[PDB]
Design a protein around this ligand. Structure first.
Ligand SMILES: [Ca+2]
Ligand SMILES: [Ca+2]
Lengths: 129, 51
């Protein structure tokens, strides 16, 4: 019954379903985690907002056309205005976060096309002068 | 002098400190060859007291 194509993800008060997935990637084979005392740096007791901020935020959609060349976002920038995550981000000097990224694009059995979806550490880009 | 540390006046997490004061021991602070003077000498056929 269970399938590589069918998945549910629940975080906080939010749930995603998909019926045509292709497994899931865990970047570098490592699930996110909290910061251990033996690797810690700032010494103040941290804020861990948990369900208020660790939940799915849906960005404005973009349109894929035959002429589209692609899209980029940065993180945590893309979520800076998102609910309590954004508030916790901006009220503090320091923050760390992992992510579940879920990219959604359905069509039909008669459409064709392929999107590469990449998560890039330190995605530094060229300037235009 | 004042003695209080952060745990006395704020809520703190546990942080293990592995860092050491190795480079501020007196031996480390003074462990350098420092120039203390510049002397001059010459070699030539001297025909006066000054030379
Ligand atoms: Ca909390
Ligand atoms: Ca305290």
């Amino acid at each position: 019954g269970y399938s590589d194509r069918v998945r549910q993800i629940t975080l906080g008060n939010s749930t995603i379903t998909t019926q045509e997935a292709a497994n899931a990637v865990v970047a570098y084979g490592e699930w996110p985690s909290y910061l251990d005392d033996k690797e810690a740096n700032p010494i103040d007791a941290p804020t861990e907002p948990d369900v208020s901020s660790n939940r799915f935020y849906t960005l404005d959609s973009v349109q894929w056309k035959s002429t589209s060349r692609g899209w980029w976002w940065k993180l945590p920038d893309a979520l800076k205005d998102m609910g309590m995550f954004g508030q916790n981000m901006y009220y503090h000097y320091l923050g760390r976060s992992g992510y579940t990224v879920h990219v959604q694009c359905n069509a039909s059995k008669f459409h064709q096309g392929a999107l590469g979806v990449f998560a890039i550490p330190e995605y530094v880009m060229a300037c235009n002068t | 002098s004042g003695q209080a540390v952060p745990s006395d006046v704020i809520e703190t997490r546990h942080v293990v400190n592995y860092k050491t004061r190795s480079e501020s021991t007196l031996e480390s602070f003074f462990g350098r060859s420092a120039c203390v003077t510049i002397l001059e000498v010459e070699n030539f056929n001297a025909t006066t007291d000054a030379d």
